[PDB]
């Protein structure tokens, strides 16, 4: 979570962070892709019957 990690629940920090655009929409998507890949990896090996 960018908002909590970068900024200590401060409104001004969030207001300045919105100025950077989508630097976390990309960061929050790669981790979900990795999680989905990990979930598929364990199923591709054992679920064969």
* 40 touching other proteins, by CB under 8 A: no
| Cα gap 18→25, rounded to integer Å | 12
* 9 touching other proteins, by CB under 8 A: yes
| Cα gap 31→35, rounded to integer Å | 6
Q: Which of 32, 38, 43, 48 binds other proteins (CB under 8 A)?
A: 32
Q: Which of 10, 28, 34, 40 binds other proteins (CB under 8 A)?
A: 28
Note the residues at the interface with other proteins (CB under 8 A): 1, 3-4, 9, 28, 32
């Amino acid at each position: 979570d960018c908002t909590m990690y970068i900024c200590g629940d401060s409104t001004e920090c969030s207001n300045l962070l919105l100025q950077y655009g989508s630097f976390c929409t990309q960061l929050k998507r790669a981790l979900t892709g990795i999680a989905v890949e990990q979930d598929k990896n364990t199923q591709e090996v054992f679920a064969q019957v």
